[PDB]
Design a protein around this ligand. Structure first.
Ligand SMILES: CCCCCCCCCCCCCCCCCC(=O)OC[C@H](COP(=O)([O-])OCC(O)COP(=O)([O-])OC[C@@H](COC(=O)CCCCCCCCCCCCCCCCC)OC(=O)CCCCCCCCCCCCCCCCC)OC(=O)CCCCCCCCCCCCCCCCC
Ligand code: HEA
Ligand code: HEA
Ligand SMILES: CCCCCCCCCCCCCCCC(=O)OC[C@H](COP(=O)(O)OCCN)OC(=O)CCCCCCCCCCCCCCC
Ligand SMILES: CCCCCCCCCCCCCCCC(=O)OC[C@H](COP(=O)(O)OCCN)OC(=O)CCCCCCCCCCCCCCC
Ligand SMILES: CCCCCCCCCCCCCCCC(=O)OC[C@H](COP(=O)(O)OCCN)OC(=O)CCCCCCCCCCCCCCC
Ligand SMILES: CCCCCCCCCCCCCCCC(=O)OC[C@H](COP(=O)(O)OCCN)OC(=O)CCCCCCCCCCCCCCC
Ligand SMILES: CCCCCCCCCCCCCCCC(=O)OC[C@H](COP(=O)(O)OCCN)OC(=O)CCCCCCCCCCCCCCC
Ligand SMILES: CCCCCCCCCCCCCCCC(=O)OC[C@H](COP(=O)(O)OCCN)OC(=O)CCCCCCCCCCCCCCC
Ligand SMILES: CCCCCCCCCCCCCCCC(=O)OC[C@H](COP(=O)(O)OCCN)OC(=O)CCCCCCCCCCCCCCC
Ligand SMILES: CCCCCCCCCCCCCCCC(=O)OC[C@H](COP(=O)(O)OCCN)OC(=O)CCCCCCCCCCCCCCC
Ligand code: CUA
Ligand SMILES: [Ca+2]
Ligand SMILES: [Cu+2]
Ligand SMILES: [Mg+2]
Lengths: 534, 59, 51, 269, 236, 75, 56
């Protein structure tokens, strides 16, 4: 018991620890966004007693927890470590001891970020940590150091895990499976592992150089020694954009499996889906300065970055039309995973179309630090990547756990988050176009209207999260009963039209990936004689 | 000298964990565990002062 | 190493055959997560003299 | 070997590592290091004794992890052809990431030099700064490094051919050549007329060449590990993977230093 | 000139640069509405008809005609709006024949204005600092978090060059109704141009997180007539 | 109109204008170091570095020249 | 390299006799002290050499 969970070398057990830590962290990051939305409900001091430093501290904590401690350890640390070895026939990962250190650095990085908010005054800097606001003159004491060490520990985690993902895919495939025969979810973790390998080392240069200015009398970014603050932004954003794609592509591969299963059709143009995922991962290294359109760059620099940013809309739109082509002419089964996937196609398109407006440098003059930007990236990260994370859990957890969930309770949960997420973020575009800046705890009185509407939706969506916590409890205590009563779905594919009920019992599963052919909780020794395909 | 084959048969017929099979492994593992405990506890005994803003008087 | 197989065997926590109800573990674990932002606020508002 | 005997052996070539304590003990040393350094840089801890202990425990805990990989390959036979091919591929992806760390330090150098700031004098190097001349002690270093990539080539090929003495001598020389490079940079540092405190020039210069200095100390530790293993008969004429990873390392560091010497010493001076 | 409650559109424009920014926003939204009309319709009429289809068309897996066509169509649309977006980019970057230059410097939670053309009758530098009026000192009718204790006075129908920098950390000079937004970085000077076509008061704010006082550092600009500006200039 | 200020200069056509101030200050001080403090068209530089350059910047460079620490090469 | 290094040793010997009165004055960017180093006296670097490096 001690050595199964502290000494582990099994990739399935480690993936369970990842998901446990990932979900404990989304609690804290949701609680911070609730405190933030209560202080923005009306003009004046509301709940924080006029402490503007504390409001800024909670905004940094909110972004770091959601990105580096929820979405990455769950989509990649969780689903990647559990389903990638099973989908290719591997008996383990390569490097099983590397696989274990890449988890145990995240608990130590949390007891570095939490103690950062409790020491002196915390880090009220934004998640980008620009200098000179984050140097020792404008932020004294050890708070910004402890936040940098936390970011260092998440980079060790993601880099070590990426090296392991790349070797396993290239070296440990089963008999007959060639690189053209991989499932689309395996392709999405493989391409993501390469973006992490080529972007993380540039971020570790930028924030280690920021640590040197603060404590070792160095002038990379200090203006009195010749340094330049605009250098830090080039180094930070050269990792940033690749990161947003490191957060959506694993969700692109989940959406492919769910949509194909509940249509009873194979993915339309499956080979052009891999080519599109590779083109988006390559064009995500050539567009980073759309995040610096107003800092004073040249006009010919800005005209290049406009056209480079726009052309990533072509490969992404191929994936959107491809997904609509597989459900056309299908036999659609509206279980809970299918509901999230259909909402993803509608809410991701909206968030991506507000990005096309932002891509032009001329128009971004009216769209800088404007709530309009906040509206763009919560449509693609919270109705995007988050919706694909719910779709995954409802798709694979009955197999992984051996326990079913209450179906009609889960459709109530879906509608409560779909309604509540739209109420928070749709009026954010109205505030931004009229000119409301971001990162403020207080505003002029003409912005009170839409700010009240968004704070109401924030309560609707937190209630939907508390219903999900109860659904987990019901699945773990009543999961075996959910199979014998009629409170859950047993088969994600139903018999075909002319297929009789008893013929269907000969082959219950019609799957194009291995994972649905294992025992319900898969065995700890899953393959002895290797699997074989033609 | 060459001791690959002799150590090869000691290791492959042993019940103990891998890091314990060599006859000389007691001399490394006993003092490391004691040193590992001091190096973890002591920084933790200082967070109370850091939250309270008390600085060490090295002067 | 050889482990066991089954339903409640691939998780680190105990759900059945325990003395205390599993509800105290399940909701206590997610309560502590939801409660760390409020502990931070308390310390910092007690430093500014607001309390 | 019939069906009965084939049943007693694995059906796949891959390595099933037993549970170990090291991955979670390294993580605790990493947190003890992070908590100690931030607390001493800001006065909450009086001296540097606790930072010293955390570095010592991060060091002796990686040694024990490396000690368990020696036994799994020399005494247990767990490194088959497929395990060997995966290890090589993981190491090439490690050095590619480390190469891009230098790529970020070369960006910072070129950003500061092509359009220099006016508080410097709008000139590179800034006024009053006396820089290191290329045709000097740095030219002895670029020859000492190029001279070790050819004595390591004949040691590797003397081991494949079965010559022991020639193999053992072409490695004892590569060791003392990297050692000589390391103390030559030490002399060049305690004599330089500027410091890392001397503005943006002393920051980008000592960062690019100071990181490379730290890798060389790691490179000299690897050739000493190979020396013990080759002299005590661990390495065989066809199975020596701890050696090829070291060899690829000495060649990438050679190319990186070549770039440093052309940009930081010949173009930027 | 001022934000209004429940507003869902641009504040009214006073310069040709903000006239052109709005024209490009509306031109782009014409095509984003065609695309959203298609995608939402195909999504709706696929769920409503194939959730009741008992036999799936499992042998349809590719199409050469539609896949080429739907790769070319997004490229034509993207090219249509890049033409006016490039023209606006170079029309706003030019600063040709201005008649006056004003410097604005950002500080830890106030602004600072300097006139150094030496046009006033005594030929000095005119300079003052601008602070938000605190809540305790407001007079009834003044606007919270907007009104300042001093303002910047400019004439109408005059081309003006703005020069922006900073003293301590990064700030941002921004006025929504004038089409102005530019970072204020310690160490360098950026410039922008304007030409105001009507009189009034135009409000803005700091747009680069600068610490606790990031919300308490507004910008207020008054545009008056030429004889009226010379009288104000020659006194203060 | 009685309003005049410096115009477009082909050496500095971009948004970044840092070197326009610094070069006019540098040219002006070396114009008076050899051609004398008073020179009809030596005022052309004096107007430009005054119009578009912060007063705190000039204040710092003046103090540095007094101690021989100005980094510009004016002598 | 020995010849070129041997010359620099005498140049170090001459500077060691120069008193601090005619040491050239620092520029604005030289000897940056945003906050003291947390070791020793707070004013010296790792490879600080009193003969060639000075803070006045
Ligand atoms: C110092 C390094 C540690 C190694 C020695 C420590 C202990 C000595 C053992 C004495 C007992 C004995 O009789 O041993 C005989 C023993 C006989 O072994 P055997 O008969 O072949 O078989 C025994 C088994 O194989 C296995 O043998 P074993 O089980 O008996 O043990 C072998 C070895 C473990 O074997 C290994 O795998 C060692 C691998 C270590 C790698 C070293 C790299 C790190 C050091 C570099 C330092 C700086 C690097 C930083 C990088 C730069 C970035 C900033 O044991 C340990 O060292 C265990 C850890 C020590 C205890 C930790 C807790 C402390 C309290 C005690 O042989 C040895 O002593 C082998 C030791 C390995 C030699 C490595 C050489 C080091 C590389 C050269 C360094 C130069 C770099 C300087 C740079 C230049 C700049 C100027
Ligand atoms: C992962 C990304 C992510 C997510 C999910 C969210 C979710 C939310 N965010 Fe935030 N947000 C950011 C990333 C994210 N945000 C970033 C980067 C910033 C900018 C920081 C900066 O300005 O410096 C930001 C800033 C930001 C601001 C700006 C504050 C200011 O500028 O100072 C506001 C304001 O209201 C806000 C609100 C919200 C709200 C109300 C939600 C809520 O609606 C959430 C709704 C849904 C949920 C409740 C989450 C689901 C719950 C889980 C635990 C999932 C579990 C699932 C399974 C395991 C299957 N966010
Ligand atoms: C999941 C995360 C995610 C994703 C996927 C994206 C995707 C895109 N983003 Fe976004 N972005 C963020 C996360 C993300 N972004 C965050 C967190 C910030 C703020 C960071 C911060 O400041 O803290 C940000 C900010 C940001 C900026 C900086 C703006 C500013 O700060 O001022 C820009 C600039 O252009 C941008 C544009 C785009 C574009 C063009 C896409 C494109 O990939 C979208 C393409 C998709 C579509 C276009 C939809 C479907 C397409 C079709 C159906 C084809 C047909 C269409 C046409 C013919 C037009 N976003
Ligand atoms: C703050 C200062 C920076 C410190 C850096 C972070 C320190 C964390 C790791 C501490 C070292 C302990 C040894 C673990 C490594 C190991 O043992 O590699 C050895 C592994 C063992 O494989 P196996 O046992 O899994 O399989 C069992 C098979 N026998 O071989 C491989 O994988 C092959 C590929 C080698 C790649 C190693 C990469 C080096 C890790 C450090 C990467 C840090 C990147 C960030 C850089 C800043
Ligand atoms: C995959 C790898 C992708 C490599 C990225 C290279 C694409 C560059 C296209 C844009 C270039 C451009 O056009 O940049 C134009 C701008 C001009 O700047 P300016 O307006 O101030 O000029 C005003 C003149 N006074 O130069 C820059 O900003 C510098 C950016 C250079 C990019 C360096 C990348 C180095 C990678 C290191 C990390 C390795 C990992
Ligand atoms: C101009 C921009 C257009 C954008 C359109 C985007 C719309 C997204 C919605 C996509 C859902 C429909 C799926 C495609 C139907 C399909 O499956 O088509 C594939 C089928 C399969 O033919 P086959 O393999 O049997 O024979 C071999 C064929 N070479 O051929 C068709 O049916 C022909 C469709 C008509 C062609 C489109 C004309 C558009 C005008
Ligand atoms: C709010 C509570 C309101 C009471 C509603 C009673 C439901 C009626 C009923 O008893 O419904 C019976 C259903 C069983 O569903 P059924 O299909 O078997 O019965 C239907 C027959 N056709 O159980 C439920 O719905 C339980 C509802 C629980 C709601 C949320 C519980 C609290 C969650 C938040 C706390 C966890 C977060 C804490 C961590 C921070
Ligand atoms: C506080 C109670 C103490 C009682 C006193 C003992 C008296 C006898 C009572 C018997 C109970 C013994 C107590 C032992 C502790 C215990 O069983 O539950 C206590 C455990 C804690 O312990 P932990 O091992 O999980 O580590 C963690 C310690 N930080 O709570 C929990 O994690 C609850 C967690 C549940 C939420 C996880 C939901 C995830 C479901 C898995 C889905 C995975 C999907 C994967 C997809 C990739
Ligand atoms: C996580 C990934 C890592 C990304 C790293 C990006 C940036 C790294 C570049 C800096 C690396 C260290 C530079 C060498 C030291 C140096 O600078 O040389 C030493 C300089 C030169 O001596 P002097 O100034 O006295 O002049 C000589 C006149 N007689 O003295 C100093 O500096 C003193 C200050 C000590 C500097 C130590 C800084 C340690 C923090 C970084 C640790 C290394 C990073 C991780 C590496 C594994
Ligand atoms: C301050 C603390 C810092 C600690 C860092 C110490 C680093 C010093 C380097 C010591 C390396 C010893 C490795 C020997 C192990 C061995 O035995 O490798 C030999 C084994 C056995 O194969 P065989 O061919 O001998 O077979 C024998 C005949 N059958 O093959 C391998 O495993 C190959 C993998 C080796 C890779 C080692 C890891 C290298 C990257 C680590 C980087 C960590 C720091 C990164 C910081 C940025
Ligand atoms: C997903 C992101 C979508 C981006 C949308 C951002 C906003 C874009 C600009 C939209 C202009 C709205 C018209 C203003 C009407 C008005 O005049 O408003 C009038 C009143 C208050 O007005 P008043 O009393 O203050 O003064 C003026 C009094 N006449 O408000 C309202 O009736 C609110 C009604 C909301 C309007 C519906 C918006 C529909 C647009 C869909 C866009 C689809 C996105 C395309 C793909 C990305
Ligand atoms: Cu100045 Cu925000
Ligand atoms: Ca408020
Ligand atoms: Cu981006
Ligand atoms: Mg900004």
């Amino acid at each position: 018991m001690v050595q199964r969970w502290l000494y582990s070398t099994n990739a399935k057990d480690i993936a369970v620890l990842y998901f446990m830590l990932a979900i404990f962290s989304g609690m804290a990051g949701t609680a911070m966004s609730l405190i933030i939305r209560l202080e923005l409900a009306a003009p004046g001091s509301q709940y924080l007693h006029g402490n503007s430093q504390l409001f800024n501290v909670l905004v940094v904590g909110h972004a770091v927890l959601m990105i580096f401690f929820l979405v990455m350890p769950a989509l990649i640390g969780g689903f990647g470590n559990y389903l990638l070895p099973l989908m290719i026939g591997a008996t383990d990962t390569a490097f099983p001891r590397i696989n274990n250190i890449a988890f145990w650095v995240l608990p130590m990085g949390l007891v570095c970020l939490v103690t950062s908010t409790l020491v002196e005054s915390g880090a009220g800097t934004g998640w980008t940590v620009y200098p000179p606001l984050s140097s020792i003159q404008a932020h004294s004491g050890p708070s910004v150091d402890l936040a940098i060490f936390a970011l260092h520990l998440t980079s060790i985690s993601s880099l070590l895990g990426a090296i392991n993902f790349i070797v396993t895919t290239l070296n440990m495939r089963t008999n007959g499976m060639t690189m053209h025969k991989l499932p689309l979810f395996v392709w999405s973790i493989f391409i993501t592992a390469f973006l992490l390998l080529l972007s993380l080392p540039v971020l570790s240069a930028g924030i280690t150089m920021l640590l040197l200015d603060r404590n070792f009398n160095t002038s990379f970014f200090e203006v009195s020694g010749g340094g330049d603050p605009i250098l830090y932004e080039h180094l930070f954003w050269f990792f940033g954009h690749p990161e947003v794609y490191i957060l959506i592509i694993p969700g692109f591969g989940i959406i492919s499996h769910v949509v194909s299963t509940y249509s009873k059709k194979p993915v339309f143009g499956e080979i052009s889906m891999v080519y599109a995922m590779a083109s988006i991962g390559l064009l995500g290294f050539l567009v980073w300065s759309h995040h610096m359109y107003i800092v004073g760059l040249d006009a010919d620099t800005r005209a290049y970055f406009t056209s480079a940013t726009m052309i990533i809309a072509i490969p992404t739109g191929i994936k959107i039309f491809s997904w609509l082509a597989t459900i056309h002419g299908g036999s659609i089964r509206l279980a809970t995973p299918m509901l999230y996937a259909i909402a993803f196609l509608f809410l991701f398109t909206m968030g991506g179309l507000t990005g096309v407006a932002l891509a032009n440098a001329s128009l971004d003059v009216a769209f800088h630090d404007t709530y309009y930007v906040v509206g763009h990236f919560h449509y693609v990260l919270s109705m995007g990547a988050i919706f694909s994370l719910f779709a995954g859990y409802y798709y694979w957890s009955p197999q992984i756990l051996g326990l079913n969930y209450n179906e009609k309770l889960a459709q109530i949960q879906f509608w409560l988050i779909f309604i509540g997420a739209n109420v928070i973020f749709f009026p954010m575009h109205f505030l931004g176009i009229n000119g409301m800046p971001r990162r403020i705890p207080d505003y002029p009185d003409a912005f009170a209207g839409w700010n009240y509407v968004a704070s109401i939706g924030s309560f609707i969506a937190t209630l939907s999260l508390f219903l999900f916590i109860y659904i987990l409890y019901d699945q773990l205590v009543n999961g075996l009963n959910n199979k014998v009563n009629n409170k859950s779905v047993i088969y994600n594919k139903a018999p075909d039209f002319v297929e009789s009920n008893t013929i269907f019992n000969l082959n219950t599963v019609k799957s194009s990936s291995i994972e649905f052919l294992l025992t319900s909780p898969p065995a700890v020794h899953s393959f002895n004689t290797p699997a074989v395909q033609s | 000298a060459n001791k690959v084959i002799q150590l090869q048969k000691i290791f492959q017929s042993s019940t103990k964990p891998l890091w314990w099979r060599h006859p000389r492994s007691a001399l490394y593992l006993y003092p490391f565990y004691a040193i590992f405990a001091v190096a973890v506890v002591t920084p933790l005994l200082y967070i109370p002062n850091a939250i309270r803003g008390i600085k060490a008087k090295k002067a | 190493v050889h482990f066991k197989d089954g339903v409640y065997e691939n998780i680190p926590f105990k759900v059945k055959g325990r003395k205390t109800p599993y509800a105290l573990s399940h909701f206590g674990f997610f309560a502590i997560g939801f409660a760390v932002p409020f502990v931070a606020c308390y310390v910092q508002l007690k430093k500014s003299g607001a309390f | 070997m019939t069906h009965l005997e084939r049943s007693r052996h694995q059906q796949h070539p891959f390595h099933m590592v037993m549970p170990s304590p090291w991955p979670i003990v390294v993580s605790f040393a990493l947190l003890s290091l992070a908590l100690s350094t931030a607390l001493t840089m800001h006065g909450y801890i009086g001296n540097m004794n606790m930072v010293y202990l955390a570095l010592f425990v991060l060091l002796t805990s990686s040694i024990l992890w490396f000690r368990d990989i020696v036994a799994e390959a020399t005494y247990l036979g767990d490194h088959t052809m497929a395990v060997r091919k995966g290890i090589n591929l993981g190491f090439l992806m490690f050095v590619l990431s480390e190469v891009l760390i230098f790529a970020g330090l070369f960006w910072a150098y070129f950003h500061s030099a092509m359009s220099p700031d006016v508080t410097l004098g709008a000139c590179w190097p800034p006024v009053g700064i006396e820089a290191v001349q290329p045709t000097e002690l740095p030219l002895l270093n670029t020859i000492i490094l190029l001279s070790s990539g050819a004595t390591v080539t004949y040691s590797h090929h003397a081991l494949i051919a079965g010559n022991r003495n020639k193999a053992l001598s072409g490695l004892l020389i590569t060791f003392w050549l990297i050692v000589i490079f390391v103390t030559c940079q030490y002399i060049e540092y305690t004599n330089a007329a500027f410091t890392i405190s001397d503005g943006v020039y002393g920051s980008v210069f000592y960062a690019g060449t100071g990181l490379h200095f730290l890798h060389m100390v790691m490179l000299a530790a690897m050739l000493g590990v190979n020396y013990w293993r080759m002299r005590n008969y661990h390495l065989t004429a066809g199975h020596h993977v701890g050696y090829e990873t070291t060899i690829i390392y000495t060649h990438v560091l050679d190319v990186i230093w070549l770039f440093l010497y052309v940009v930081f010493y010949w173009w930027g001076v | 000139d001022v934000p209004t409650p429940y507003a869902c559109y641009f504040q009214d424009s006073a310069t040709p640069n903000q006239e052109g920014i709005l024209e490009l926003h509306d031109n782009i939204m014409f095509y984003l509405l065609v695309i959203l009309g298609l995608v939402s319709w195909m999504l709706y009429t696929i769920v409503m008809t194939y959730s009741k289809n008992p036999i799936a068309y499992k042998y349809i897996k590719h199409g050469q005609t539609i896949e080429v066509i739907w790769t070319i169509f997004p490229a034509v649309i993207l090219l249509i709006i890049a033409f006016p977006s490039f023209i606006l980019l170079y029309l706003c970057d030019e600063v040709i024949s201005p008649a006056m230059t004003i410097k604005a410097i950002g500080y830890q939670w106030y602004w600072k204005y300097e006139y150094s053309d030496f046009i006033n009758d005594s030929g000095e530098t005119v300079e003052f600092e601008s602070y938000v009026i605190p809540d305790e000192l407001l007079e009834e009718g003044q606007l919270r978090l907007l009104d300042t204790d001093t303002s910047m006075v400019v004439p109408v129908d005059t081309h003006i060059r703005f020069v922006v920098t900073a003293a301590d950390v990064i700030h941002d000079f921004a006025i929504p109704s004038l089409g102005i937004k530019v970072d204020a970085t310690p160490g360098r000077l950026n410039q922008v141009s304007a030409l105001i076509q009507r009189e009034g008061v135009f409000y803005g704010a700091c747009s680069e997180l600068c610490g606790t006082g990031h919300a308490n550092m507004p910008i207020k600009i008054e545009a008056v007539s030429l004889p009226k500006f010379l009288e104000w200039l020659n006194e203060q | 109109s009685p309003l005049h200020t410096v115009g477009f200069d082909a050496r500095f056509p971009q948004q970044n204008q840092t070197k326009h101030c610094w070069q006019s200050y540098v040219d002006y001080h070396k114009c008076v170091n050899m051609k004398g403090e008073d020179f009809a068209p030596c005022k052309v530089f004096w107007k430009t570095y005054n119009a578009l350059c912060p007063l705190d910047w000039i204040e710092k460079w003046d103090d540095q020249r007094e101690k021989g620490i100005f980094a510009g090469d004016i002598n | 390299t020995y010849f070129v290094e041997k010359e620099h040793a005498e140049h170090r010997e001459h500077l060691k006799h120069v008193p601090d009165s005619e040491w050239p004055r620092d520029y604005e960017f030289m000897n940056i002290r945003s906050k003291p180093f947390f070791w020793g006296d707070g004013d010296k670097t790792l490879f600080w050499n009193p003969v060639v490096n000075r803070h006045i």
